[PDB]
Amino acid sequence: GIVEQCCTSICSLYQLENYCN
Amino acid sequence: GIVEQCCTSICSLYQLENYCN
Amino acid sequence: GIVEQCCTSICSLYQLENYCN
Amino acid sequence: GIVEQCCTSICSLYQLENYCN
Amino acid sequence: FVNQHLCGSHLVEALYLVCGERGFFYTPKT
Amino acid sequence: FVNQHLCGSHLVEALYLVCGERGFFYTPKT
Amino acid sequence: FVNQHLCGSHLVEALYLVCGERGFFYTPKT
Amino acid sequence: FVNQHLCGSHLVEALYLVCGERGFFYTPKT
Amino acid sequence: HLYPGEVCPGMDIRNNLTRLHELENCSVIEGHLQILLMFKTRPEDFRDLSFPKLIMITDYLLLFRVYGLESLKDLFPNLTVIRGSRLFFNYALVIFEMVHLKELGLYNLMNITRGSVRIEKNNELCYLATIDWSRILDSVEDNYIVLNKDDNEECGDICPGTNCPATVINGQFVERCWTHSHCQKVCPTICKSHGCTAEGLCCHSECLGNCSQPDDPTKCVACRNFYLDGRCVETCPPPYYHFQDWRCVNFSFCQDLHHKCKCHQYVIHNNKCIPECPSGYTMNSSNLLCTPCLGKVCHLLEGEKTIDSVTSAQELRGCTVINGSLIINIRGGNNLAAELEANLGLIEEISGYLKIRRSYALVSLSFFRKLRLIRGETLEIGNYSFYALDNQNLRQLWDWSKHNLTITQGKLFFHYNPKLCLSEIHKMEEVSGTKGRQERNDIALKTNGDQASCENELLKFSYIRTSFDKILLRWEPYWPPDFRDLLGFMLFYKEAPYQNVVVDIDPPLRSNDPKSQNHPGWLMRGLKPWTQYAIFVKTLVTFSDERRTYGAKSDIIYVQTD
Amino acid sequence: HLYPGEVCPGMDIRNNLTRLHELENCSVIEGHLQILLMFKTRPEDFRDLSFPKLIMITDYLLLFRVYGLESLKDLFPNLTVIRGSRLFFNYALVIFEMVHLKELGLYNLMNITRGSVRIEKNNELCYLATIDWSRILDSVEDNYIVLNKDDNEECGDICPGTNCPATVINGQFVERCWTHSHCQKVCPTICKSHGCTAEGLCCHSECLGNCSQPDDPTKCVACRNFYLDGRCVETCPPPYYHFQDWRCVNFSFCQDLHHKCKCHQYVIHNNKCIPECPSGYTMNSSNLLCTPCLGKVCHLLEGEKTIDSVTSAQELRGCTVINGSLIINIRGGNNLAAELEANLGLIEEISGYLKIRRSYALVSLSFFRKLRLIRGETLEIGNYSFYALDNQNLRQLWDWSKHNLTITQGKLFFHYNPKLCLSEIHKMEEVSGTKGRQERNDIALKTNGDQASCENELLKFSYIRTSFDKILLRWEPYWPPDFRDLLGFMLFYKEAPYQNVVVDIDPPLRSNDPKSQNHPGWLMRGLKPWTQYAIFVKTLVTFSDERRTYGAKSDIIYVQTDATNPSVPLDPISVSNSSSQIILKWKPPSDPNGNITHYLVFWERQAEDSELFELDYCLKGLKLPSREEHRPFEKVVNKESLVISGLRHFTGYRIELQACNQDTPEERCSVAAYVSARTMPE
Amino acid sequence: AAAKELEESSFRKTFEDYLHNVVFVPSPSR
Amino acid sequence: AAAKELEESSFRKTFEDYLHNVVFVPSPSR
Ligand SMILES: *[C@@H]1O[C@H](CO)[C@@H](O[C@@H]2O[C@H](CO)[C@@H](O[C@@H]3O[C@H](CO)[C@@H](O)[C@H](O)[C@@H]3O)[C@H](O)[C@H]2NC(C)=O)[C@H](O)[C@H]1NC(C)=O
Ligand SMILES: *[C@@H]1O[C@H](CO)[C@@H](O[C@@H]2O[C@H](CO)[C@@H](O[C@@H]3O[C@H](CO)[C@@H](O)[C@H](O)[C@@H]3O)[C@H](O)[C@H]2NC(C)=O)[C@H](O)[C@H]1NC(C)=O
Ligand SMILES: *[C@@H]1O[C@H](CO[C@@H]2O[C@@H](C)[C@@H](O)[C@@H](O)[C@@H]2O)[C@@H](O[C@@H]2O[C@H](CO)[C@@H](O)[C@H](O)[C@H]2NC(C)=O)[C@H](O)[C@H]1NC(C)=O
Ligand SMILES: *[C@@H]1O[C@H](CO[C@@H]2O[C@@H](C)[C@@H](O)[C@@H](O)[C@@H]2O)[C@@H](O[C@@H]2O[C@H](CO)[C@@H](O)[C@H](O)[C@H]2NC(C)=O)[C@H](O)[C@H]1NC(C)=O
Ligand SMILES: *[C@@H]1O[C@H](CO[C@@H]2O[C@@H](C)[C@@H](O)[C@@H](O)[C@@H]2O)[C@@H](O[C@@H]2O[C@H](CO)[C@@H](O)[C@H](O)[C@H]2NC(C)=O)[C@H](O)[C@H]1NC(C)=O
Ligand SMILES: *[C@@H]1O[C@H](CO[C@@H]2O[C@@H](C)[C@@H](O)[C@@H](O)[C@@H]2O)[C@@H](O[C@@H]2O[C@H](CO)[C@@H](O)[C@H](O)[C@H]2NC(C)=O)[C@H](O)[C@H]1NC(C)=O
Ligand SMILES: *[C@@H]1O[C@H](CO)[C@@H](O[C@@H]2O[C@H](CO)[C@@H](O)[C@H](O)[C@H]2NC(C)=O)[C@H](O)[C@H]1NC(C)=O
Ligand SMILES: *[C@@H]1O[C@H](CO)[C@@H](O[C@@H]2O[C@H](CO)[C@@H](O)[C@H](O)[C@H]2NC(C)=O)[C@H](O)[C@H]1NC(C)=O
Ligand SMILES: *[C@@H]1O[C@H](CO[C@@H]2O[C@@H](C)[C@@H](O)[C@@H](O)[C@@H]2O)[C@@H](O)[C@H](O)[C@H]1NC(C)=O
Ligand SMILES: *[C@@H]1O[C@H](CO[C@@H]2O[C@@H](C)[C@@H](O)[C@@H](O)[C@@H]2O)[C@@H](O)[C@H](O)[C@H]1NC(C)=O
Ligand SMILES: *[C@@H]1O[C@H](CO)[C@@H](O)[C@H](O)[C@H]1NC(C)=O
Ligand SMILES: *[C@@H]1O[C@H](CO)[C@@H](O)[C@H](O)[C@H]1NC(C)=O
C-alpha cells in the first residue's frame, strides 16, 4: 500500500517507477 | 456469668447459642 | 497461613481446633 | 526541465543526483 | 432481637425462645 | 458459628472464644 | 532523492515529480 | 543545502558542487 | 423527454480535459464521477466548457487537485440530484485540495438522498454559510468543513437585495445563496418531498426536487423513485423490472446484459434485475430467477478485511457466510449504526477470528443481528479468536436474552474499555462456554468499565431526615468479606429541577453484628427550601488483584426541602 | 560488675504471669522479649511485680493484648538500651492493642540503636508528645503512632514545674517528660555519644547512655560496643572474640557452643564467634576457622520467599547462591534501600525466577550489587523469568556501564510503571540479549513511564528575544518522520529565584525544507521587570501503537527580564533637627523595578506667602501661625535618609524625592513624591 | 476531555490516507 | 494524588497480618 511503502518503509525511485506508466 | 453477660453486658444470640446444645 | 485460611477461605472449628492445644 | 525543477520548484540533492552519473 | 440488660422471667422467656428444643443438658461429670 | 471470612479483632475474639483455656504454646524447638 | 517517510502534499508533489508525463491510467477492467 | 530557486552562475556552481567528478556524459545515441 | 440524453456510466478523468468530451450528451450518469490531478490547467480551459446535460448522478462525485478552476456553475449548471447508493466514507460529494476553487454556483442541486458532503483544504472557497444543507440533506451533522478561505473570515458573500432567503437558523437571519447572483431556492413547507415548481406549487407525487410543470408525471424534471419513458413511476408495471432503483427494464434488456461476461452477471428476483441471489437460492437457465432450494460464502481477499465505513460495508451487503476474518476499526465521530445495521451480518459463521480495534462511537453491537458461531480457524496472533481495544462508548455487547454465541477456539482480549463493566464480560464467558481458557490479564481488570459504577451491590436507605437546612441519610451498612477494605463512602449530591439523571463519609465501627449500631450518616447544611435535590452514594473500598468485592452504589433519590 | 545479672536468652510469655518468674535475675537478655495475650489478668497482678534488673535488650520487645496493665514504670523501670540486631518490620518496640495501657514511665530508656517504634490501637495511652525520639533514635521519620488516646485530644500530660525540658521542635517549646513525675532526661550537646552523668559530665569513651561515674570504663552503666569483665571495651584483645557484637569470649566458650547440636553450630572468623562461613571458605577441625579454599547456597523453603522488610532480609544476609525464586513486595512509604542494600545481593545467580509486585518506594535496583545471572529454572506463570508491577517510584534499574545481566530463560513483564520509560527497558532487553522472546503486551505500552518525557529528542533554541514585557523564543521545528503526527507544542514556564529545578503552540506548515520558513515561536506578555524566569518546552505528538517516534523536549532555561521606572518612595518624613539641618527619611518604594542605583533628591526654597506683606498686624487679629531651572539636588546612594545642610532659618521648603534604578545612561527614575518642611528658627 | 479532537485528527489523517490509496494502484499492472 | 495513603492503609493491614501470622502457628505440632 501507499503508506505501507512510502511511510512504513521509504519508497525508491524504482518502486515509484511502476507508478509511472 | 449470667448477669455478667446478659445484664452487665448484653448477651448476643451467638453467646446464647452455646446455651443451646 | 492465617488469612490464607480464615480470610482467603473460611476457617472451620475443626481447623481452629489445632490452634487449641 | 531545468528551471522547471530548480526555479519553478526547488531541486533536491537526490534530484540532482541523477545529474551525477 | 432485644438489645437490653435482662433478668427474671424476661430472661427466662428469652432463654426459652433461644433454646426451643433441647438447649441444655445436665452432665457435669455424668 | 459464623460462616464468614474473618480478620482483625473479629478474628482475635473468635480465636479467644475457640481457645478459652490454654489453646496455644510457644515451643517450636523448646 | 529524499530518504524519508512521506505523506500528504509532500507525497503528492513527490509523485508528480516522479510522473511528470502520463504516469497513471484508470483502466482496472476497461 | 540551499532551499531556493536557482538560475545562472549560482545554479552553475551548484551543479559543479553536486557533480565534483564526472557527473555528466554526452551519449544520446553514441 | 424528461431525460433526452443518455446514461453513459461512470468513468473518471485524469491529467487533462481531453477525455471529458466522452461524457458530453449524457443525461444521468450511472455510477460515480471523479475528476483528479490536473496541475497544468488554466482558467481559460473552462470558459469554453460546459455540461448542462447532466442532471442526476447515482452514486458519488469527487473533485481533487485540479488547478485554474474557480467555480462550478458553468461545468454543471443543471446537476440536481445525488442518489448515493455507492457512497464514499458516507460522503457523495468530495471537494478536496482544490487550488483556486472559490465558489460553486451549484444552485440546481436540490436533494442529495443518501450520503454527505465533506469540504477540506480549499483555501479559496467561500459562499459556504449561505448553504442550507437541511434543504438538501437530512443528517447535516455529518458534514465536515475545515481549512478554507471561509475559515479566515474575509468573504462578504452577499447579494444585492430582494430574492435570497434570509432565514434564522442559529443566531440570526442567514441569507441563502450560491453566488452573488444565484440565490438558494426554498420550496414551501408542503412541497417538500417531491419539490416545487418556480412559483411554488407542488410537483407530482413521482417528481423530485424540480418539475417543468406542477403536478405532472409527464412534466417533471427528476423522478422520485423510478423512470419509465417520459413518466416518473411508482413501480414497474409488468413485464418490467426494477434496475438500480431508478427505472423499469424489460426481460430482454437484463437478459442480454447477462450474455456479455463470456463482471456482474445478473439475475432477476422480486420483479428486479439484481446482481446475485442470497443463500438457499438457485439461478435459472430460462429466466434467471432466484428459485428457492435446499441447504452465500463471501470469500474475502486473504481472509481479511478492514471495515471502516459504508464503502467497506456494501461489499458485504447481504452476505451469509464469511470465509475469513473481520477487522472493525472506525475512527468515527458519528454513529453509522443504523446504516451499519442496514447492510451487515445476517450471518451466523466467521471462519477466522474477529478483531475490534480503537473504534470510538460504537456504543453497542446490536447491529450484529443473527451471528452465532465463530470458527476461529485462523486466530489473532497470541491465540485469540476475539479482540477488543479502546472503545470509548461501548457499554453493551448484546442482550443475552435471545442473542447467542458459539466459540470454537481462541481466547478473549479486553483492554481499555472504560464503560465495559465486567458483569456482561463474565456473561459472555458463560454463554461462550469457553470460560476454561482465559488466563490472567486477558481482561484488563483496571480499565474495563471504570467510568460508571455497574456491578451488583445496591445501598438501601434505612432512615431519611429532612429539613430546610439539614439532611441526614441512614442506610444499611454493607461490609465486604474483608471489613478492613471499606475505606469510606463517596456521596454525590446536587439539585435537580428535572429528574433526568460531592462529599465523603468515614466508615463507622463494625465490631459486631448482633446489634451493629453503625447506621452511617451525613449531615448536609447547604439546603435551600422548596428545592428538589438529587443525591446518591457510592461505597469507597480497597482494590484487590483477585475477584474483588464489587462495592455498592445507592439509588439516585430526589428530596424536596421545605 | 556493670551487669550483676545473667544473660537468660529470650523467651516470650503468654496467657498468665506464671512463666514471668523464669526471667527475673538476668541483666541483659540476648534475643527478644514478647509479652502477649493475657486477657484474664488484673491491675493487682502487676503491683506485686517488678524487674529492675534488666538494662539492655539485644533484639526487640513486644507488648500485645494484655488486659489490666496501665504502665511500665514498675515492670521495667531500668531498661535502657535496645541494640536491634533482629528487627521487626524495622521496629524494635511494639506497643500494640494494649487495653488500659495509659502510660509508660520509660524514662530510663536512653538510646535505641537500630530499628524504630510503632504504637497503634492503644486507646488509653498518653504522655506521648512529651517524648523526644531524636534523643533516643536517629531516623525518627519511621515511627508510626496512631489510634491512641492522644488522637482524641483529652490528656493533660503535664508536670508541676521546674525540671522537664521545654524544647522548641516545630512551633513552640515541647515539655519533655514520661509521667507527671518523670521528666525526659537531656544530656548536653557534647556528651551525646556515650551519655552523660547526673550533673551532665561526659562519660567514658566506651559508656553508653548512662554512666554511674563520669569518665570511667569501670563505672559506666551500658557499654557502647563491647563488654569485658567490668570494663566496656573498644575491641576484644587476644585471645578473645567478639560475640554477637557485644562481648569478648574465650576460645573454649564458642568451642563448646559447637558441641551442643549433637540449631546454629558456630565457627570463628575475624576474631568473631559467628554462625557460618561465606563462600570460598571451609571449617576447621582444630579451631573452626573460616579458612579460604577453592570454589554458600541459601536454598529456600519451597524455593520461594516473600520479602518485605529487614526481618525478611537478614535471613538472606551474606548469602551467595539462592536456590529458589524471589518475590519483592514492600507496601512501604519509607526508603529502606541502604539497609536493604546492607544485607542483600552479594550474589550473582537466582535459580528460579524474579518477581517484583506492588512495591511503592523502591526508586532503583542498585542495591543488587553483584547480581549477574538469572537462571529461571522455575518460571513465573505466563512463562516469565521476570515480573514487574505497580512501582510508583521506580525510575532506574541499573547503570549499564558496569552492571551486566544474563538471563537464561523466561520473558519480561512490564506493567503500570509510570516513572519507567522504555529506553532503559530496551537497554535491559539489549544487555539481556533476550530481545527475540518478548511478544506484544509483555510491555504495557501505555502506562510505563507516562509521567515524564524521557527518551532522546532534544529541542534547541535558535533565537531569544527579551523585553520587560515581551518574550519570544525561536527554535528548530522538529518533525517526526510522519509529519502529520505533530499535534502541538507543550510549554512550561514559571519564575525562579533559585535555579534548583503552561501554554500550547500550534505547529506551522512544514511544506518544504530548502527554506522551511517555519521556525515556531510564542510571545509572552505576562512579564515582571528584572525578574528571573524558568522556561522549557515539550513536543505534543500523536501516539502510535508501533515503536512511536519518541518526541522532543527542551532544556530548562533561565532568563531574567530587563526594569521600568521605580515606584513612589514611600513615607517621606522631613524633620528639621537643627536650624539648617533637615533629615529626610523614607521607605523603599513598592516596586524597585531593577536594582536601585540611587535616590534623586530635590529641595526647593519656598518663599513666604505674599499676602502676609500687606496686612495690619497692629490691628487686632494678630494671630500669627507658628509654622528648565536647576534646583539643589542630591543622588543619595545606598541610604534611605538624607540630612540637608546650608538651609535658611524660617523658610518653608518643598521636597521632591524620587528613586532611580538606572544612573549611568539616561537615568531611569521614579515618579515624584512630595513633602514640605521648615527649619528651626535660630 | 478533548480526546475526541485527538481521534478526530487521526480520522482526518485516515481520510487523507484512503484517497491516496485510491490514487496509488491503478497504474502497476505490468 | 493521595494514593500513598491508600497503600499506607494496606501497609497497616499487612502489619496486622504479620503479627497474627506469628501468633498463629507455634501451637499445631501434633
Ligand atoms: C430526498 O428525496 C427522498 C425521496 O423520497 C426523500 O425521502 C427519503 O427517501 C429515502 C428513499 O426511500 C428513504 O430512505 C429509506 O429509508 C427506509 C427506512 O426508513 C429504508 O428501509 C429504505 O431502504 C430507504 O433507505 C428516506 O427515509 C426518506 N426520507 C424522508 C425524510 O422521507 C428525502 O427526504 C429527500 N431529502 C430531503 C432533504 O428532502
Ligand atoms: C546510639 O548509640 C550509637 C553508638 O555509636 C550511636 O551511633 C551509631 O552507631 C552505629 C554503630 O556503630 C552506627 O551504625 C553503623 O553505620 C555504618 C555506616 O555508617 C555501618 O557500616 C555499620 O555496620 C553500622 O551499622 C551509626 O551510624 C551511628 N549513628 C550515628 C548518628 O552516629 C547512635 O547515634 C546513638 N543514638 C542516638 C539517637 O544518638
Ligand atoms: C453527442 O451528440 C452528438 C450528436 O449526435 C447524436 O449522438 C450520436 C452518438 C449519434 O447517436 C447521433 O445519431 C445523434 O444525433 C454526437 O455527434 C455525432 O458524432 C458522430 C461520431 O460518433 C458523428 O458521426 C455525427 O456526425 C455527429 N453528429 C452531430 C450532429 O454532430 C457526439 O458524438 C455525441 N457525443 C458523445 C460523447 O457521444
Ligand atoms: C426490450 O428493451 C430493449 C432495450 O430497451 C431500450 O432501452 C431502455 C433504456 C429504454 O430506453 C427503452 O425505451 C428502450 O427500448 C428494447 O430494445 C430497443 O428498442 C428500441 C425501441 O424504441 C429501439 O429503438 C432500440 O434500437 C432497441 N435496442 C437495440 C439494442 O436494438 C426492446 O425493444 C424491448 N422489447 C420490448 C418488447 O419492449
Ligand atoms: C534468681 O536468683 C535467686 C538467687 O539465687 C541466685 O541465683 C541462682 C540461679 C543460683 O545461682 C544461686 O546460687 C544464686 O545465689 C534464685 O533463688 C535460688 O534458687 C535456687 C534454685 O533455683 C535455690 O536452691 C536457692 O535456695 C534460691 N536462693 C534464694 C536466696 O532464693 C532463683 O531461683 C533465681 N531465679 C531464676 C529464674 O533464675
Ligand atoms: C573460658 O570461658 C568460660 C566461660 O566464661 C564464663 O561465662 C562468660 C559468659 C563470662 O561470664 C565469663 O566471665 C565466665 O568466666 C570459663 O568458664 C567459667 O569460668 C569461671 C571462672 O571465673 C567459672 O566461675 C565458671 O564456673 C566457668 N563456667 C562453667 C560453666 O563452669 C572458663 O574458665 C574460661 N577459660 C579460660 C582459660 O579463660
Ligand atoms: C498458539 O497455540 C497453537 C496451538 O497449540 C500453537 O501452534 C502449534 O505450534 C506447534 C509448534 O510451534 C505445532 O507443532 C502445532 O501444530 C501448532 N498448532 C496449531 C494449531 O497451529 C502456537 O504455538 C501457540 N502460539 C502461542 C504464541 O502461544
Ligand atoms: C510455557 O512454555 C513451556 C515450554 O514449552 C511449556 O511447557 C511445556 O508443556 C508441554 C505440554 O504442556 C510439555 O510437554 C513440555 O515438557 C513443557 N516444557 C517445559 C519446559 O515445561 C508451557 O506449556 C508454556 N506455558 C504457557 C502458559 O505458555
Ligand atoms: C438462540 O437464541 C434463541 C432464543 O433463546 C431462547 O431464550 C433463552 C432465554 C434461552 O432459554 C434459550 O435456550 C431459548 O431457546 C433460540 O431460539 C435459539 O435456539 C438459540 N440458538 C442457539 C444455537 O442456542
Ligand atoms: C560486567 O561488567 C564489568 C564492567 O564492564 C566493562 O566496562 C563496560 C564499559 C564494557 O565495555 C564491558 O565490556 C567492560 O568489561 C566487566 O568488568 C565484567 O567483565 C562484566 N561481566 C560480564 C559477564 O560481562
Ligand atoms: C499459667 O499458664 C500455664 C500455661 O498455659 C499453665 O500451665 C498454668 O496452669 C497457668 N496457671 C494459672 C494459675 O492459670
Ligand atoms: C491528455 O492525456 C492523455 C493521457 O494522460 C494523453 O494520451 C494525451 O496525449 C493528452 N493530451 C494532451 C493534449 O495533453
Residue numbers in the entry:
A (entry chain O): 1101 to 1121
B (entry chain U): 1501 to 1521
C (entry chain Q): 1301 to 1321
D (entry chain S): 1701 to 1721
E (entry chain V): 1601 to 1630
F (entry chain R): 1401 to 1430
G (entry chain P): 1201 to 1230
H (entry chain T): 1801 to 1830
From the primary publication:
Insulin plays a fundamental role in metabolic homeostasis and its dysregulation underlies many metabolic disorders, including diabetes mellitus (DM) and cardiometabolic complications. In the current studies, a novel class of insulin dimers is described that function as insulin receptor partial agonists (IRPA). To explore a structural basis by which the binding of IRPA to the IR might elucidate partial agonism and biased signaling pharmacology, single particle cryo-EM studies were conducted in the presence of RHI or IRPA to examine the structure of IR-extracellular domain (IR-ECD). The partial agonism of IRPA derives from differences from insulin in IRPA binding to the insulin receptor, differences in receptor mediated ligand endocytosis, and selectivity or bias in downstream signal transduction.
Cryo-EM structure for a complex of a near-full agonist IRPA with IR-ECD (IRPA-9:IR-ECD) was also obtained. Indeed, the resulting IRPA-9 bound IR-ECD closely mimics the T-shape RHI bound structure where one insulin monomer is bound to the α-CT helix and the L1 domain, and the other exposed to the solvent with no direct interactions with the IR. Deuterium uptake protection at region 1 was clearly detected for RHI and IRPA-9, both of which are IR full agonists. Among the two regions that show pronounced H/D exchange protection upon ligand binding, region 2 around residues 701-714 (α−CT helix) showed protection across all three comparisons (RHI, IRPA-3 or IRPA-9 vs. unbound IR-ECD); protection at the IR α-CT region in response to insulin binding has been previously reported. Structure-function interrogations revealed that partial agonism can be tuned by site of attachment of the linker (e.g. B29-B29 vs. B1-B1 linkage), and further tuned by subtle end-capping of insulin.
